[PDB]
Amino acid sequence: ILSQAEIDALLNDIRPYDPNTQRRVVRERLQALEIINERFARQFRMGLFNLLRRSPDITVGAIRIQPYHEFARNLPVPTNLNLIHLKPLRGTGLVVFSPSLVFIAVDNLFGGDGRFPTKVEGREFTHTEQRVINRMLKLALEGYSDAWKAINPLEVEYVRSEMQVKFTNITTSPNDIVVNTPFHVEIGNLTGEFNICLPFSMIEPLRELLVNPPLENSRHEDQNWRDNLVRQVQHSELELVANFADIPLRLSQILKLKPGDVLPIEKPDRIIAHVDGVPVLTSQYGTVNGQYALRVEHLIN
Amino acid sequence: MADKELKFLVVDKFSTMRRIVRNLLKELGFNNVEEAEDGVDALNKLQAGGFGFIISDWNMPNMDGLELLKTIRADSAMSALPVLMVTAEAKKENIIAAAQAGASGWVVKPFTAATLEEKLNKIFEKLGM
Amino acid sequence: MADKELKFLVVDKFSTMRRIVRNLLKELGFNNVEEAEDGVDALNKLQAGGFGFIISDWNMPNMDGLELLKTIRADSAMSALPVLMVTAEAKKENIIAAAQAGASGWVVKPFTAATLEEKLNKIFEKLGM
Amino acid sequence: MQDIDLIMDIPVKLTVELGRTRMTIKELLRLTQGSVVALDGLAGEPLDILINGYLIAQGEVVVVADKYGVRITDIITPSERMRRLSR
Amino acid sequence: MQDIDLIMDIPVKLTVELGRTRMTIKELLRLTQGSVVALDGLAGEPLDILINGYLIAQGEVVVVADKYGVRITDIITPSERMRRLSR
Amino acid sequence: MQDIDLIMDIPVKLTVELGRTRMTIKELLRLTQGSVVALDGLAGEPLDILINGYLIAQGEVVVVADKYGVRITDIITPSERMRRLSR
Amino acid sequence: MQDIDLIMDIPVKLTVELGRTRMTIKELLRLTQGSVVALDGLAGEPLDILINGYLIAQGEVVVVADKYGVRITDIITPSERMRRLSR
Amino acid sequence: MQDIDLIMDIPVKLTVELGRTRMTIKELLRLTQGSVVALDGLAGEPLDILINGYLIAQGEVVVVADKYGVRITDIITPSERMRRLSR
Amino acid sequence: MQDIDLIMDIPVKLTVELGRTRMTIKELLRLTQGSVVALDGLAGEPLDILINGYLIAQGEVVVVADKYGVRITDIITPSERMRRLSR
């Protein structure tokens, strides 16, 4: 069985800005998404072991981030496309089942020895194959929902099934950024793959939650830790800076400044104290014990 | 660039596969696409003329892809017509037989749109289109 | 360094052992790994070609490792193909017979990943890879 | 001086600071209405003059007809620049 | 709502800023035709939206039928505002 | 050059504006999340470069390694100066 | 919580120290390019975490995606603090 | 040399800083056990060497027999001195 | 004296000790508010002057305008160094 390359062999830092790129991309690593995918992977491996009576090997691939059109362009056709909803997040998610994985599951469920792989002829899946895909998708959605519980409880609901990417309509524009997580499934000598693709706008509100690699916290231990940390930080020193007033001028007048020159300024009724440029309070100025003193009036809330 | 008005003949025993191929060609800028259910219908439509490219499946009822390619090559008016072969199993013997018959390209199911676009570009470059 | 795209053929009667060997090879940087259930299937896949290294078990149904190694060495196109022998019992007579047959290495079950890596490195150094 | 006038044609903001001091946040929280905070600068010393937060000169407080004013006293130079840097 | 309508009967100008940066005047004079200036904002970050020079929101650049557009994303909020100030 | 260096030892802020437009406050209130606002500048035209709110040059948007950048194209020039002031 | 938020609207600087050691100025002058200086802290011990020069916690060095990071381990506590002081 | 010896008969403390960064107090409060904080210094860059809080040199981290060590690389130098002060 | 000025550019802390004495912890526990502890130094003797805990000179207490002050009297030298060592 010749691969495409074998068949071909035998037969033979400055970039322009395109506003059609939606550059709101996350250059930070989504560790939390990686942990969720690992948990999802394990929970599903179990489910597949229970369903198929065989031990599956599921490998999580790299979480590649790319525009939607590129993701669509790299999807083998025909393929089983399933639309899912991740409540309460807004949007439609995709669970992509490759025909090879579907055929392997059908073989295992119906007593297939696995010695005769079924070649994809490009035909539509039958009703029995549709029911098998249904069961696999239900198991996958249950595993995904259970995996997401530790970070953010989400309800996964199946919407409809499609065979062509054009009917998915999960993104407003072909250039929209989506998050795709490929999975490789090995069953005996047969290898299958499936993909989970999520639009970035769906997970954009949870960007900070997805960023850091988090877990193992508490409610009372963390409470005491936070209280003691707050107590410790209160001893830190800050530089309190009070500005007398502000004068709008030009650079030419600065060059003409000489000893004795008087610059008119508006008399401030209150003096604003700034910490690293951030105002914290308003006060009146005075002299106490031979030093300039500020009489606090209000604290900036 | 290849002529966007080039006429394509998609031959496959499955209507869904033909629709998928037509949509992929439309996404590539080719809108003149006709469909054939088997080799006999493909040859009958070829006798009408006007086609510039053929995408045919290997195993089809009443005529397989190899016999259709041989018939096309045996016809002087269509001997130079490029034919793209799409199959489910890439057996070496079948590929060698198709190459000896004069196949312009080979695609293995399942495939992506990128692979089809690359094959079409290579075929057009070989033909100088 | 050995070519990371080198194709490996793992032959063993147990699927779990083949999966373990494939995972160990993947951890070593080799991702092109195929599996064979017995000597007959291993020879059939070898007739396809493209393999650069073989890991085969000694006792396998319908063909043992020694007969498979002898058949590989008897073939001119595959006489230079390295073969790694993995066994459960390291009898001196069997080891001598395999060495006379042209075995590139020998591994005894159970083994660690370090031992397999050392054997692969030694075989590659002997072959100049 | 053409480029010089070109850049001069830009409005900029001047800032005069009464003084600087360092305190802990706990002490800041202990401050209420009427609380007293001392500054590190001696009474009568010329006040720092800043342009967009950059210290370039020192001046003295005067009252102009009903408005506060700053009398330019002395500028900087790398010597004072380094001097205040070390200071 | 009455005062809301009264001020509603007024036109105002909205300003969108690509980014901000700080440089010396010497570097500005070194700039010629084709010179390159980098901005402190990362590529793809929402751009500042200003009303009469006052930052009130952030938005993203879109193209509308042949025209540039700004997609409203989030209001300024006090904390982000103070952060930009300290910047 | 002496005064040039003296003013060179000062930090200033540079501002790049995507575009300008005029709208009523009622239209601003009609704007919600996802609303579209058109700008008076044509797509691709060089963007205004401002120093402390003063327009001094024009530039084009570029991406530098992962960051937005402005390519200096041409100075403001004074006839265009008055013209834009009048606009 | 009100005062907590009021002080929360303030930026502060965090400092992580690799280690501490004592040496004479003569030894410092004997240091050249490539010279080696030993630290009093054992290899692998958590590093001191300081806020504006004040030690409040200890952490361990980690690498985050291409950047150094400090893993929070334990707060300073009074006894450990007094111990470091006596040190 | 006499004054050199007179000051040589004095103990001083040396401080090595892993890196520096700026963050808001709100972000500091969001930090818990296991939280990750990035530093402004690139991985592998020589670390700042301070004497009583004064930066005088830079060094690289080494492990000595079971202990952390700093390899002296280069002195601070004064142009870089002002630059870091400005930072 | 270049290296000398280099090292001088470091802030250091000076400590003046009123006196020293030795007592048992039981006696320390017997101390309450108003308790009296005697020092080994005679009244009027110059007080020890320490730099970072290192004794380098002796001085006398004076009052400066409203503030305590130490009048430098005499330094050390290995003779006094050994003398106080033996003392």
Author numbering:
A (entry chain A3): 5 to 16, 34 to 322
B (entry chain A5), C (entry chain BB): 1 to 129
D (entry chain A6), E (entry chain Au), F (entry chain Az), G (entry chain A1), H (entry chain A7), I (entry chain BC): 51 to 137
Sentences reproduced from the published study:
The bacterial flagellar motor is a huge bidirectional rotary nanomachine that drives rotation of the flagellum for bacterial motility. The cytoplasmic C ring of the flagellar motor functions as the switch complex for the rotational direction switching from counterclockwise to clockwise. The basal body is made up of the LP ring, MS ring, C ring, rod and export apparatus. Here, we present two high-resolution cryo-electron microscopy structures of the C ring-containing flagellar basal body–hook complex from Salmonella Typhimurium, which are in the default counterclockwise state and in a constitutively active CheY mutant-induced clockwise state, respectively.
2D classification results showed that the C ring in the CW state (CW-C ring) also possesses a C34 symmetry. There are in all 34 CheY** subunits, which are bound on the outer surface of the middle subring of the C ring and form a CheY** subring structure. However, the upper, middle and bottom subrings of the CW-C ring have diameters of ~446 Å, ~440 Å and ~470 Å, respectively, which are all smaller than those in the CCW-C ring, indicating that the binding of CheY** induces a more compressed structure of the C ring. The inner diameter of the inner subring is also shortened to ~312 Å. CheY** is bound into an open groove between two adjacent protomers on the surface of the middle subring of the C ring and interacts with FliGM, FliMM and the prior FliMM domain. However, in contrast to previous predictions, CheY** has no interactions with FliN and the bottom subring in the structure. As the consequence, the whole FliGCC domain undergoes a rotation by ~180° and a movement by ~8 Å toward the next FliGCC domain and inward contraction by ~10 Å to the center of the C ring, which results in a reversed orientation of the αtorque helix and changes the periodic CCW distribution of the charged residues R281 and D288/D289 to a CW distribution on the upper surface of the CW-C ring.
